[PDB]
Amino acid sequence: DNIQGITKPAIRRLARRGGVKRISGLIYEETRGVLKVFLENVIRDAVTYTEHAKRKTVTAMDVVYALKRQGRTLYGFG
Amino acid sequence: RDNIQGITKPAIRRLARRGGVKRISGLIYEETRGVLKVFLENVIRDAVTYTEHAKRKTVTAMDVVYALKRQGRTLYGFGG
Amino acid sequence: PHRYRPGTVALREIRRYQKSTELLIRKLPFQRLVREIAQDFKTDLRFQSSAVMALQEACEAYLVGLFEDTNLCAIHAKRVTIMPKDIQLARRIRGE
Amino acid sequence: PHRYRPGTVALREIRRYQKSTELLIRKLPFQRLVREIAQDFKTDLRFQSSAVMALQEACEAYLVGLFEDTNLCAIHAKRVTIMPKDIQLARRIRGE
Amino acid sequence: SRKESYSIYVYKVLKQVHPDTGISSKAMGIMNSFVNDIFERIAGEASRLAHYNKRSTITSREIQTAVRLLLPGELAKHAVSEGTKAVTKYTSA
Amino acid sequence: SRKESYSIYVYKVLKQVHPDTGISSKAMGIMNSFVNDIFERIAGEASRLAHYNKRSTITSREIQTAVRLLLPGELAKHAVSEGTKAVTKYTSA
Amino acid sequence: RAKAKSRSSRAGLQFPVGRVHRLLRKGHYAERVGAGAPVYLAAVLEYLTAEILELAGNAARDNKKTRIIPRHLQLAIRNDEELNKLLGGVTIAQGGVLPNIQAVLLPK
DNA sequence: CAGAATCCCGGTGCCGAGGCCGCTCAATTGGTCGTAGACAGCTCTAGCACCGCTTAAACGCACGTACGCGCTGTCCCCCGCGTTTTAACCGCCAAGGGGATTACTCCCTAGTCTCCAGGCACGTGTCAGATATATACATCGAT
DNA sequence: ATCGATGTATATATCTGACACGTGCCTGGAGACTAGGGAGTAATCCCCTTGGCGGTTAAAACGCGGGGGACAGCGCGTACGTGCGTTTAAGCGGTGCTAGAGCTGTCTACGACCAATTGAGCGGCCTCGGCACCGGGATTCTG
User: Is the Cβ–Cβ distance between G98 and G78 less than 8 Å?
Assistant: First the structure.
């Protein structure tokens, strides 16, 4: 159970970058669930591309393609 | 021209009724007309662009299907 | 005389139009509007009888979807009547 | 004594973190979380050092965008405190 | 000119699922559009998957992967079994 | 072995717009991926237009129509102007 | 065998017309590719690159810097109404957000 | 709880789906051989693990003031119903611009073969940058 | 009626190591010649496109009696913020191992391209039965 590794201070800092002035005490568990759901959909795709190539090492390109298919093209990692 | 007035108030009411809206404030109509005009303009510009590439003078249903297809909405039943 | 209380007819209409399927905008006014807007880009264009129907169907679907979204935004503020700020918010969040 | 009024440090934090560009989540706890989720699909997986960073950047950009949207739908309700229903509403209107 | 369509095949399947039921022309037009839509999505993804590996030929493995990527879990779960059975029978013939 | 990127051409252009400024490797990586993105969009749209008209070749007419579709109204006017200038100079060379 | 000279020089362009031509033929977009497609596409790409670099270079001087970094590119893109429309969905690493606070949040 | 709005059934009645023959041109069987896809054998990089000291950051606790919320007043403006006005609406009639085709025919391209110079690595050095110091003064607060 | 303490900013001092010019070299790009079929062009047929007039109520319009939904206001209680204190394991520097990704070479199974045939499918016409429009009734549900 490593979901507890996303500590409360990090959540506050992220809300601060977004301009949030005051945060209710229940936002943390919802944010944890949202992050877990977002990660699962990307990881499943990355693993799918990795397996098709018969490689055992996950590569940056696999994540780049996985994000592009959902429309979240990421610039910077080649 | 005045043709924008052709989308009468009752048509807007029936459309809002289909969406389940129970009570509608009297100012929603002008906003809806403005919102509709920009969509039509956007679709027609692409349609006319496709028509012009083909050197045709009549605009066909296929050009409208492709315009909607590019904007990200697909229409079933007219062809394609 | 018999008179229905406010909203009873609205619900009856909602049920009627949700169960029905015909188009709700008048064909001729829309046809004239389509020919009017096209006039700014190119003159003497011609339109097929089905293209006007395709445009009308697309517009009715788009507007119905926007009104469905706007109703959630209206209930969220504890109101029932939808208002322009609700439309503006829906469009902003959708990224229009 | 001397003491700042509630919220002024928050505003100073907003001005600070909107100016900086570093990553805000701890690298090692996030790496362990990525390691834990991938294990359900395949065993003995390896991750390049840059892959976890790419995932972290994408997750932080997603949370930032979701919080930006949640703030708008929070002010709209005449509140300032964001709450779970604001996230659920934003996600519903966004269609997710 | 002659126009091709999938209408006869859709009708044969309908007759197998419900012999007594019939279909209107509008439904035939919708099905005829839906088939081409899904065809283009799958062929497109199979093409992208081919270039990333420098392969010059598309094979059943590319189709299986594209299907698993595009369709949701249970639909993919059944469709992969259908395709596997079909390919097995075809190769055995 | 030998890799391929546009960092050289980005540098040549940079020395023409601002001959006194330099660019970090982090900015260069973003500029290199941005070009590959726009290249793929234009070639994709041009191929679709060519297929609908049932033509075997891609010509400047296809590029122009795609450019008018993908790029906003203001960028298109300038881009098309200099594209036609370039083609005119090449054909007249 | 006359002395060869590059096509990019004849058109007056910096981008490689030969490489773009090769990439079109190897992409299978169509079975035949005309002579004018690559010159036009190269000219368009050069224009868009020059506009981005010009705006980033102007943004750099406002910070007394002499070297371009990702933060300046992000500030250049999110500040232009045309570039922002073409790049509304692209995410740039290390870019951060633009400074913005709703007036309702500022002190009374 | 009287009574207006609704569903439902039996009847008359009509053109859409279902069946058919003509016949062609898309698909199949059989044939060939060029290069791509398959493997093992091997190089050497970097992902994984542990050692250790230090501490930036975290967990935790106190308390106080600021926000979210419930009830309230009361009013002004969308609703539900009535009578008058209009252009949509079906339908019948003209007639011709444009769309789809055959046929000709030419010039723009893909292919082979040559060869060189553009740009892709390994080598580096110096000066653009960040870290470490003190201090000015603005704001938010207390007096 | 007003004064100043913390923090951000800024300025001067210092060394680090990324950006830029160089040489060597290798294989992508441009020069020269050719064959063919995609494309450009004119002529034709004829349909479905634009335009008009008849006439009847569907649909829209303007009024209006009025009540229910909207906001602006007061009272308040406990949820969240700022700050102090303790300690945790996040951070980093270094040595080592080898899993496993990427390149060289051989090789033969698979597919695209040709010759020839013919029935699955496309087209126009016939026809008969399921839906459609009507009318009369009991029922539901509401103010």
Answer: yes
Residue of C nearest to D90 (CA): C93
Residue from G31, G43, G32 nearest G7 by CA: G43
Instruction: Give the CATH H-level superfamily of domain B1-80.
Output: Histone, subunit A (1.10.20.10)
The whole-angstrom distance between B60's CA and the closest CA on chain E is 17
Strand I, nucleotides covered by protein (CB < 7 Å): 5-8, 18-20, 27-32, 38-39, 49-50, 59-61, 68-71, 79-83, 89-91, 100-103, 111, 121-123, 142-143
Which class would CATH give A1-78? mainly alpha
CA angle D3-D7-D13, nearest 5°?
A: 100
How distant is the Cα of A71 from the closest Cα of chain F, in angstroms?
13
Domain that holds residue E41: 1-93
Contact G107, D15 (CB under 8 A): no
CB contact under 8 A, D76 and C93: no
Tally of domains in chain E? 1
- Give the 3-state secondary structure of residue E61: helix
Query: Which residues in chain B have their CB less than 8 angstroms from residue C44's CB?
Result: 57
Residue F38, CA distances (Å) to C73, C77, F32, G70 in order: 37, 43, 11, 19
Distance of F90 CA from H91 C1′ (whole Å):
61
- CB A75 to CB G93 under 8 A? yes
Q: Six-digit token pair at G48?
A: 């868009």
Nearest CA in chain G to F25: G69
Element (H, E) at G32: strand G32-33
The experimental method, as deposited, was cryo-EM
Within F1-93, strands assigned E span 22-23, 57-58
Q: What is the rounded CA–CA span in Å between residue F55 and residue G33?
A: 11
A40: Cβ contacts below 8 Å, ≥ 6 apart: D37
DSSP secondary structure code for residue C82 in this structure:
B
- Cα–Cα distance for residue pair A75/F70, rounded to 1 Å: 20
Both tokens assigned to E90: 């075809």
Resolution in A: 3.9
Cα C70 to Cα B1, C9, C23, C90, D87: the distances in Å are: 29, 21, 21, 6, 17
Residue A49 · residue A66 · CB < 8 Å: yes
Q: Is residue G65 packed enough to be buried (19+ CB in 10 Å), middle (13-18) or exposed (0-12)?
A: middle
CA distances from D18 to A49, A76, B4, D56, F61 (A): 36, 21, 45, 18, 46
Residues in chain A: 78
DSSP alpha helix (H) spans, chain F: 7-17, 25-52, 60-70, 73-92
3-class SS at G73? Answer: helix
Contact call for residues D73 and D86 (beta carbons, < 8 A):
yes
